Design a protein around this ligand. Structure first.
Ligand SMILES: [K+]
Ligand SMILES: [K+]
Ligand SMILES: [K+]
Ligand SMILES: [K+]
Ligand SMILES: [K+]
Ligand SMILES: [K+]
Ligand SMILES: [K+]
Ligand SMILES: [K+]
Ligand SMILES: [K+]
Ligand SMILES: [K+]
Ligand SMILES: [K+]
Ligand SMILES: [K+]
Ligand SMILES: [K+]
Ligand SMILES: [K+]
Ligand SMILES: [K+]
Ligand SMILES: [K+]
Ligand SMILES: [K+]
Ligand SMILES: [K+]
Ligand SMILES: [K+]
Ligand SMILES: [K+]
Ligand SMILES: [K+]
Ligand SMILES: [K+]
Ligand SMILES: [K+]
Ligand SMILES: [K+]
Ligand SMILES: [K+]
Ligand SMILES: [K+]
Ligand SMILES: [K+]
Ligand SMILES: [K+]
Ligand SMILES: [K+]
Ligand SMILES: [K+]
Ligand SMILES: [K+]
Ligand SMILES: [K+]
Ligand SMILES: [K+]
Ligand SMILES: [K+]
Ligand SMILES: [K+]
Ligand SMILES: [K+]
Ligand SMILES: [K+]
Ligand SMILES: [K+]
Ligand SMILES: [K+]
Ligand SMILES: [K+]
Ligand SMILES: [K+]
Ligand SMILES: [K+]
Ligand SMILES: [Mg+2]
Ligand SMILES: [Mg+2]
Ligand SMILES: [Mg+2]
Ligand SMILES: [Mg+2]
Ligand SMILES: [Mg+2]
Ligand SMILES: [Mg+2]
Ligand SMILES: [Mg+2]
Ligand SMILES: [Mg+2]
Ligand SMILES: [Mg+2]
Ligand SMILES: [Mg+2]
Ligand SMILES: [Mg+2]
Ligand SMILES: [Mg+2]
Ligand SMILES: [Mg+2]
Ligand SMILES: [Mg+2]
Ligand SMILES: [Mg+2]
Ligand SMILES: [Mg+2]
Ligand SMILES: [Mg+2]
Ligand SMILES: [Mg+2]
Ligand SMILES: [Mg+2]
Ligand SMILES: [Mg+2]
Ligand SMILES: [Mg+2]
Ligand SMILES: [Mg+2]
Ligand SMILES: [Mg+2]
Ligand SMILES: [Mg+2]
Lengths: 50, 70, 249, 66, 99, 49, 91
RNA sequence: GCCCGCCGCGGUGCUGACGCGCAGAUCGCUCGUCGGAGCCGGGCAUGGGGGCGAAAGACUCAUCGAACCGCCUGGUAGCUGG
RNA sequence: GCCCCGGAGGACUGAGGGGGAGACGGGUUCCGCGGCGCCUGCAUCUGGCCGCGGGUGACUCGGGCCUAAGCGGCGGGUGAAGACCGGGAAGGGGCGUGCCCGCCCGUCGAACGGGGAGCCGGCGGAGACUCCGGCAGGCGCGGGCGGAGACGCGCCCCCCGGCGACGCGCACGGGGACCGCGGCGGGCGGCGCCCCGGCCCGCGAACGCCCCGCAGCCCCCGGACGCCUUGCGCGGAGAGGGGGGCCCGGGGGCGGACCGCGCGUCCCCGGCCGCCCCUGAAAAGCCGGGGGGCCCGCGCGCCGUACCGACCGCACAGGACUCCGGGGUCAGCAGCCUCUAGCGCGGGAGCGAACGCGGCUCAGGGAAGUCGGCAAGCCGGCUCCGUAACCUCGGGAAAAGGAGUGGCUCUGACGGGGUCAGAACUGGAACGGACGCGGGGAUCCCGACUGUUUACUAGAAACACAGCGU
């Protein structure tokens, strides 16, 4: 909606910011083979209830 | 940068809990200059952006340069 | 079964009265010091239609008797009352349509309306459009007055109960047929959720004691006794007799 | 914005109520910028001569033609 | 050409305080301009008719002199209602006393 | 009807016809007596004579 | 030229509702659309505004009356009997 | 609470299409109604043997001659399968 | 050269839009650059997909405030409790001490109701009533007279009032915007013949001052067989006539800064009239009355603001509120064609079998077919003629049946404008030439009628209904 409360805006803002890949130097640093962050989401198939 | 060369305005990130009157006073005490008007918004990520226009007899180039902004 | 329609109306919600945009409760003027020792003068300000009510109402302004300013009353209008008229309330008021007098001071034969069944209660009898009470006789030694109610019953009230002279305006309202289902819809939309009505024999047995059967029919007598329990007390309750016949006098 | 009779024009000048004057050639337009309103007077060039000489020396004048 | 415009207000629900008119701008464009509701002027306390002399503007925007009439009960009674109060007062004094 | 009233009023004002003639023809116009403007101008001549 | 023979103002109803109802409405509806006499104006300009409420369009006075006529016959008799009872109270 | 008819609101017949669907009820043509007991949006109220019903045992989030969720509960079976 | 991009051609959506924008829901899908591993049911160099950078600025718009239907709270009351129910309670303010006044909740509940005040031009890859320039408006803070009259020209408390503030309707009238025709100024196109006959562009806001404003209500003289509407309506409780006052979302002139004339359409407003056993919110806030006591400066905080039918149906011919609405034909917001704007829809090519699905035509006969005229066909616009039984006298009724209708050249009627009426001539013996658009009649049963229902196999004779009765 274009008319949203600041409290809903802030919780939506955090899901946008943390929706990221693992950095590549972290993959070298921590010696990882699983490289996908499975807590990511995509707007077409998500149901963020926030 | 276009904002400073014309319109004499500097764009800053500030703590979300600050109002326009607290922003004007802070900028005037830290950079030793004269503010004219402050616009603000909260970005889609949660930060606060301030549009700070300096007084019509001050060059924000002279003030952005001393700060490093250029 | 389930709870029947008459059992669901006592709980409130969709069966509460439609009181929005009503003018207020209609009452006589409160009995006070000045009215007991004399009479107080008011002036008719407006004649107004009240939602859900057949007779009209009147706004009457009286002076403040315990301070400065005015006091505004809401009366049920006797027929013949008109804007700008001067009315009177008290023991010394005269016999004119619109005045409020103790029923002991009113001569026998008079038409009155909005009568108190106990003193100072502010009026509860003969309030509907076209109705009136008669003053039948005075019993001075016991301080009681005899009146005839709109049903034809007789009753004894105190002689210090008050009344308004005249009969209620709006009379003859029921003599016009409602022609259409739509005129009935508009009448009850201003009162209550009580219309339209579905017959008990048109229902299933779970819904009503009259429901079911391969032909629509009640099955037993529809005279039920006075001590029947809720959910059971449908049809004709405690009927002395039934059927259509003349000869009553 | 509003128009003005010539005599009122100098008095606003005489009390230092003007901030800038502009002379416009077309009948000449004289526009005076006060705190509240912009005022406009139309005169022929013959008439505007004398008025500008009376022009308050504390009142900046500019010209304009094209 | 094509002269269709979009809505000017926060929502498009066309209530009685969201009516516009249309006007052509100096840049050759069709603009929308709100049409304010016009309040009534004050009405007589005895007769319910418009009081003469007061413009249909909310009194916050009218100077003090513009909001008044120069007579006893200036903006309360319509002039005829005053004359009837004056006669009733004077004549009742003449009948409640000296017969 | 606007045409016939506009003509009838013009005459009364100029005193071509009086007020009692004006009012009689005013009612005849309202009752569909004259089909156009020419017919009313003869009735006016014929009543005056 | 007369446009109906019997139905009068109930021609607005068409063929609906039966003869006995339309007969009742012709009398009732003729009565409530009528012009009555101001008891004060003395002019014939009283019209109904709601059930029980009658206003002179010349006096501007407002009056309380019957549902479909200005005066009812019960109220005429009541006013007549009440008046005689007051005058009898006078010695 | 008149008649023909557009949007809208509804859903008659073809027992047409589809029936491993476009679809866990849709599509085509035809059809009822269209100033009224008319249609639509938001807010608010009524809670399970209870509600709500112009009454079909209808509707109450694909659930109704008694909703849904967890537990009592690995409920009991002279009956079917192994 | 890919279904992407460009140029040229051919078409479509068809102003209730496959157009331009909001509300709700979604949440970064928005923008620029790169890219094809996944997805884009065919392909891809495309993309709402993947990587990397960015992006939403308000005194005037909305939210914050007010109250609606409601919902909470309330000395207490009740119940084993959880909890549920509630006015009968020593219920707070102004100041300045000290006096005085006072009956008793809610800074809960509307991003459509109420509400102090914003317009034009310009700039960017993505924001604008928010930025920049210009011109204004609102709320704050600091440096007793004139008139015959209608009427004209600082405050505080108590009381009385006002504004806020309100239904529906066929019509009639006025303004704005739109739309056309003609002139004149500038530019285009095509051109076998004709063409001063085709196309595009000719723009002016909020706000301030002056003038002008029909209806409607008011004042003065004076004393009546009239004034006047499409309709009405009004007058000795003072008409007409003569001269005035007030209101009027409007118009003009000067500021801000090309010229005429018309039929309609939409939107708002006006005065009337009709209708109801229906009579069509409240409050904050702001103002008046009666009585008593007494120019120049500065500022305006907090939150929303990108984009989308990218929403719900496991992703999808379903479902999903509102705003703006050109031209021709026409009774028209119908059908059919179109200017502006916009351009997807799990992919292509070949062949022209059966059989299906949606369509078309058929000699002669005309329901013999079938449970049954199911399906299909006939009728249909407008004008004139002509219309029965029966009836609750309103209907039946478009009953049934007939005739005319193009093009061209003209004539008459109404006070510049379309309509209505008539005639000559002419064409396969044609004309509502597409489109749109009743088949009719004689009867019997049931229910009086409009209305309601088994969402998803039943729309009815079932339910409801006015009336009648207990
Ligand atoms: K947004
Ligand atoms: K989503
Ligand atoms: K039960
Ligand atoms: K039960
Ligand atoms: K029961
Ligand atoms: K029940
Ligand atoms: K009901
Ligand atoms: K019933
Ligand atoms: K039964
Ligand atoms: K339809
Ligand atoms: K088939
Ligand atoms: K369907
Ligand atoms: K109709
Ligand atoms: K209940
Ligand atoms: K419930
Ligand atoms: K249950
Ligand atoms: K259960
Ligand atoms: K369970
Ligand atoms: K348990
Ligand atoms: K068992
Ligand atoms: K068993
Ligand atoms: K088994
Ligand atoms: K790319
Ligand atoms: K207890
Ligand atoms: K309790
Ligand atoms: K609220
Ligand atoms: K609302
Ligand atoms: K609001
Ligand atoms: K309101
Ligand atoms: K007063
Ligand atoms: K924005
Ligand atoms: K083949
Ligand atoms: K075959
Ligand atoms: K047959
Ligand atoms: K058929
Ligand atoms: K012809
Ligand atoms: K039926
Ligand atoms: K109907
Ligand atoms: K079925
Ligand atoms: K059904
Ligand atoms: K049906
Ligand atoms: K039924
Ligand atoms: Mg902001
Ligand atoms: Mg049944
Ligand atoms: Mg039972
Ligand atoms: Mg109808
Ligand atoms: Mg119909
Ligand atoms: Mg089928
Ligand atoms: Mg169990
Ligand atoms: Mg088990
Ligand atoms: Mg097309
Ligand atoms: Mg993109
Ligand atoms: Mg593919
Ligand atoms: Mg505002
Ligand atoms: Mg609140
Ligand atoms: Mg609002
Ligand atoms: Mg944008
Ligand atoms: Mg309202
Ligand atoms: Mg936007
Ligand atoms: Mg054949
Ligand atoms: Mg046969
Ligand atoms: Mg056979
Ligand atoms: Mg029926
Ligand atoms: Mg029906
Ligand atoms: Mg079904
Ligand atoms: Mg069906």
């Amino acid at each position: 909606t274009a008319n949203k409360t600041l409290s809903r805006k802030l919780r939506l803002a955090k899901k946008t910011k943390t929706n990221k890949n693992i950095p590549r130097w972290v993959i070298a640093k921590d010696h990882l083979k699983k490289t996908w962050n499975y807590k990511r989401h995509h707007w077409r198939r998500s149901h963020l209830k926030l | 940068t276009t904002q400073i060369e014309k319109n004499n305005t500097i764009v800053f990130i500030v703590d979300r809990r600050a109002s326009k009157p607290e922003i004007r006073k802070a900028f005037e005490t830290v950079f030793e200059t004269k503010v004219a008007r402050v616009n603000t918004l909260i970005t889609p990520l949660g930060l606060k952006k301030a549009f700070i226009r300096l007084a019509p007899d001050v060059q924000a180039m002279d003030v952005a340069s001393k700060m490093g902004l250029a | 079964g389930r709870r029947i329609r008459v059992q669901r109306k006592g709980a409130g919600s969709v069966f509460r009265a439609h009181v929005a945009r009503r003018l207020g409760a209609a009452k006589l003027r409160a009995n006070d010091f000045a009215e007991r020792t004399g009479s107080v003068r008011g002036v008719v300000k407006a004649i107004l239609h009240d939602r859900g009510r057949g007779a009209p109402l009147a706004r009457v302004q009286f002076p403040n008797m315990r301070g400065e300013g005015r006091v505004n009353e809401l009366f049920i209008a006797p027929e013949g009352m008109y804007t700008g008229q001067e009315v009177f309330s008290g023991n010394k008021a005269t016999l004119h349509i619109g005045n409020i007098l103790p029923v002991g001071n009113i001569p026998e034969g008079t038409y009155v309306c909005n009568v108190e069944e106990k003193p100072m209660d502010r009026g509860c009898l003969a309030r509907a459009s076209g109705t009136y009470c008669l003053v039948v006789a005075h019993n001075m030694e016991t301080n009681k007055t005899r009146i005839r109610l709109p049903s034809g019953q007789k009753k004894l009230i105190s002689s210090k109960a008050r009344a308004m002279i005249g009969l209620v305006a709006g009379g003859g309202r029921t003599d016009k047929p409602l022609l259409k289902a739509g005129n009935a819809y508009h009448k009850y939309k201003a009162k209550r959720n009580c219309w339209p009505v579905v017959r008990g024999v048109a229902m299933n047995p779970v819904d009503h004691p009259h429901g079911g059967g391969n032909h629509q029919h009640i099955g037993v007598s529809s005279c039920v006794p006075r001590n029947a329990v809720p959910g059971q007390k449908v049809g004709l309750i405690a009927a002395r007799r039934t059927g259509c016949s003349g000869g009553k006098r | 914005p509003n128009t003005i009779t010539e005599e009122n024009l100098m008095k606003m000048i005489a009390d230092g109520r003007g901030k800038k004057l502009v002379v416009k050639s077309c009948k000449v337009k004289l526009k005076l910028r006060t705190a509240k309103y912009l005022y406009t007077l139309t005169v022929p060039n013959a008439d505007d001569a004398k008025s500008i000489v009376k022009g308050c020396k504390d009142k900046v004048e500019v010209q304009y033609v094209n | 050409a094509d002269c269709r415009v979009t809505c000017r207000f926060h929502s498009t629900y066309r209530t009685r305080s969201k009516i516009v008119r249309y006007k052509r701008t100096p840049g050759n464009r069709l603009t929308s301009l709100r049409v304010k509701k016009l309040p009534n002027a004050p009405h007589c306390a005895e007769t319910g008719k418009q009081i003469h002399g007061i413009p249909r503007v909310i009194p916050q925007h009218l100077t003090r002199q513009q909001r008044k009439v120069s007579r006893p009960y200036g903006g309360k009674l319509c002039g005829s209602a005053l004359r009837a109060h004056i006669l009733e007062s004077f004549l009742n004094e003449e009948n409640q006393a000296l017969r | 009807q606007r045409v016939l009233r506009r003509l009838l009023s013009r005459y009364r004002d100029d005193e071509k016809i009086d007020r009692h003639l004006y009012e009689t023809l005013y009612a005849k116009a309202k009752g569909n007596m004259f089909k156009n403007k020419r017919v009313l101008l003869e009735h006016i001549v014929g009543m005056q004579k | 030229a007369k446009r109906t023979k019997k139905v009068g103002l109930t021609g607005k109803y068409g063929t609906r509702y039966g003869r006995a109802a339309r007969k009742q409405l012709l009398k009732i509806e003729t009565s409530q659309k009528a012009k009555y006499t101001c008891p004060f104006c003395a002019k014939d300009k009283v019209r109904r505004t709601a059930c029980g409420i009658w206003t002179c369009r010349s006096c501007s006075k407002t009056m309380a009356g019957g549902a479909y006529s200005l005066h009812t016959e019960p109220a005429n008799a009541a006013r007549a009997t009440i008046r005689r009872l007051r005058l009898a109270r006078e010695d």
